[PDB]
Each structure stands twice: as structure tokens, then as C-alpha cells.
């Protein structure tokens, strides 16, 4: 709830670091959640197809 009163502070949107924490946490979690799942290696066979 804490509005700081008579303070003024120099924010930045593009020089910001916390965006790269979001980015690394995202990739490291995506890649973690795939490790237990079925690798499609046996499925690289010759497909025969029609429309």
C-alpha cells in the first residue's frame, strides 16, 4: 500500500534487467517441462502420402 511521499525516482524501460530474468526463467522452465516427454525419433520414417 506504500506511496512513498516526497520521493522522485529515475525509472527505465529499455535498460531494465528484470525482463532478462523473465526471459531466462521462461526458457529454463519450458525446456525443463519437455524433458520427461516422448521423443519422436522412431517416427522419422519415409512417409507415403496423398491429398
Amino acid at each position: 500500500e506504500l506511496v512513498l511521499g516526497n520521493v522522485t525516482e529515475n525509472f527505465n524501460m529499455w535498460k531494465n534487467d528484470m525482463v532478462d530474468q523473465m526471459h531466462e526463467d521462461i526458457i529454463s522452465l519450458w525446456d525443463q517441462s519437455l524433458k520427461p516427454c516422448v521423443k519422436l525419433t522412431p517416427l522419422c520414417v519415409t512417409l507415403i502420402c496423398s491429398d
Binding site: 500500500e1 506504500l2 506511496v3 512513498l4 511521499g5 516526497n6 520521493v7 529454463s28 525443463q32
Partner: protein, 132 residues
């Protein structure tokens, strides 16, 4: 803005108040410095730094005097080159964050003085206790 239940429980909430008026709130910051798969290592590393931050402060306070006192006097005189303001500006006009912009110059000079003041005092008390 200021309320003693929560002002430093989200930290910082008195920082506009000027240095004299801020000095009644210090306890709320102190009591909040220590709250609480690879994410296990993230939390452990974050916790262990927050402990060492706290202990390294409490150790400095031990060595200079005073051991837990939040506010204490020190028997180190304030040098003319630092003396650039009348006391009333410091206590009644500046904010703590603004005062830091000044005394963030030359700080370790003060810590060297503060440490050695305590050494000489413990040498002196030891002789008084040797007579006593």
C-alpha cells in the same frame, strides 16, 4: 505514507520525511531485513545472501560499538572538510537518501576512525578492571 505497522514491512516508506522525523521509524526496517529442481538452488542462494548481508552489518555494529543499539554516539569528532552544513539542515531539511549523496564520499575514513576508537576504549577499560 508513514504508518509504523507496515511502512518498512514493504521497506522504505518513510524516505520523504526528513532525517529527524525518519529517526522514530528505524525498528520497522530492522525487523523486516530477514523475512521468508534448479529453483531450489535459486531460493537457497537468495536466502543465504540475505543472512550474510544481515550478519555483516551486525558485526560492523559490534566492532565499532554499539552492539545492538540502533542509535549511538561514538567519540569520533566530525572533521571540518565534512562540516559543510549547519546541523538544522541535516536534521530538519534533508532526506536520508539526499544526505547519503554527500557522505557516500569518503565513508571508509569514518569506519577506520570508528573501529580504532573502540580498540583504545577496550584497552583503557581493561586497565580500570585490572585495578578493580
Amino acid at each position: 505514507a508513514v504508518g509504523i505497522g507496515a511502512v518498512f514491512l514493504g521497506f522504505l516508506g518513510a524516505a520523504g520525511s526528513t532525517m529527524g522525523a525518519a529517526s522514530m521509524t528505524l525498528t520497522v526496517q530492522a525487523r523486516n531485513l530477514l523475512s521468508g529442481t534448479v529453483w531450489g538452488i535459486k531460493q537457497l542462494q537468495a536466502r543465504v545472501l540475505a543472512v550474510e548481508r544481515y550478519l555483516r552489518d551486525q558485526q560492523l555494529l559490534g566492532i565499532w560499538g554499539c552492539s545492538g543499539k540502533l542509535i549511538c554516539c561514538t567519540n569520533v569528532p566530525w572533521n571540518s572538510s565534512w562540516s559543510n552544513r549547519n546541523l538544522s539542515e541535516i536534521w530538519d531539511n534533508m532526506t536520508w537518501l539526499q544526505w547519503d549523496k554527500e557522505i557516500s564520499n569518503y565513508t571508509q575514513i569514518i569506519y577506520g576512525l570508528l573501529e580504532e576508537s573502540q580498540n583504545q576504549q577496550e584497552k583503557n577499560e581493561q586497565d580500570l578492571l585490572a585495578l578493580d
